[PDB]
């Protein structure tokens, strides 16, 4: 079942913003956004798609441990830590492009598309080149088919090892208290219009589960705080997290 | 296994009215550091840091099938309001719920629990006294230096139980994180036997080394409980490898 709740376009109007934030309680089984349009809406998943891209890497042996070192290839880019040698924990950390780009080399066309397939993925259209595909290719993914995809990796559900969906979720850890724990990943989608930043994801307390999903427009770099901080506003509105 | 002694780092537990030792292992230098080699060296009970091997054995064994099984509260009212609920492995881990591991034990059993501590070689691997109350009141012993010996093969998954008990036992320690650190640790308050100490045990993983620490130290009261973590992050803030703030 799904809900609307309008009050939400608070946090979007007081950040001179405009998007949407998808929850979903595990316990409950209950969903809720502030628009059930745009909840629907399927855009490019950008850097999001580091989470089906490592448990690839991972069943397939292309990714050993998230200890297994991958070099820097001498390539200078623009964004400074992508210029050093990364390990699984901090290519997810630092969005590394130039490390998943060989992962997905690694994996093939033909492996990436039918085990993307096995995830039920979003459209499952890898069309475009293997190596940038979720960045100015054809595949599309909604705030609401996020939350689905999230859900089978937080049940390890997902047609892969345990072992591969467990380093993942620690791959994902971003922000831990004695309070809660998320989970998540971010995105910005610059190539195909609309420029938009994603934020997915989970908040895990001690008797529930909060899965998330926000997208918002971004048509400047100057604005990729607000993807967390817009959906922080929610969580505490919910009382999800404290203030 | 070079150490190095600090005595700079007393000025934390004399300005705080407190005694006691921290232990620092730097992986990539294989370098240790510590303000009291001696201290460093002093075994003592384990007292709920012990929910580190116990939980591995538990797991292992197949006497906790998941980090979601529900072990439901037995109905008994006990002062810890925390402790008189339902709880799975990573809240009874962060609650530190006794009467929740006591069970674990009992299901163990002796044999069992002694072989895994022989295999694991931890402390000094006796489990003399109840078999469900051995790490507060019985004769199991532990050093500061023996917490990173053993932390530091539970980090590279070379425990003699499976890969997958040691992903999780390393989860369920999950205390802190942030975009400069991550913390995996366990607190112990051990006030059976004289002397009553504290313990915080775990590590900081950093994006390119990961710094183990073992500290304990004299706890006459419960006031000062919360001087563990403090008198901890006070050490690793001098040496840099958190931030003050930022
Ligand atoms: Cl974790």
Redesign the interface.
């Known amino acids: 079942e799904w809900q609307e709740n309008k009050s939400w376009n608070a946090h979007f109007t007081e950040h001179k913003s405009q998007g949407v934030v998808v929850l979903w309680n595990e316990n409950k089984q209950q969903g809720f956004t502030n628009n059930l349009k745009r909840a629907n809406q399927a855009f490019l998943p950008a850097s999001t798609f580091k989470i089906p891209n490592s448990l690839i890497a991972l069943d397939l042996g292309v990714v050993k441990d998230e200890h297994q070192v991958f070099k820097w290839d001498g390539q200078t880019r623009d964004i400074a830590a992508w210029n050093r040698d990364h390990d699984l ?2 290519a997810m ?1 630092y969005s590394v492009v130039p490390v998943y780009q060989e992962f997905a080399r690694q994996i093939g066309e033909a492996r990436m598309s039918k085990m993307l397939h096995a995830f039920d993925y979003g459209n499952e259209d890898i069309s475009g080149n293997v190596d940038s595909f979720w960045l100015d290719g054809g595949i599309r993914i909604s705030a609401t088919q996020q939350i689905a995809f999230l859900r089978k990796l937080y049940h390890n559900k997902l047609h892969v090892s ?2 591969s969906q ?1 380093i993942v979720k ?1 791959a994902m ?6 309070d809660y ?1 998320i989970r998540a990943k971010t995105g910005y989608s610059t190539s195909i219009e609309p420029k938009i930043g994603w934020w997915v994801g989970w908040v895990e307390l ?1 008797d529930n589960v909060w899965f998330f999903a926000m997208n918002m427009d971004m048509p400047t770099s100057d604005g990729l705080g607000l993807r967390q901080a817009i959906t922080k506003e929610v969580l505490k509105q919910e009382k999800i997290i404290p203030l």
């Open positions: 924990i901090t950390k345990e072992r467990r620690q850890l971003t922000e831990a208290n004695g724990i001690d």
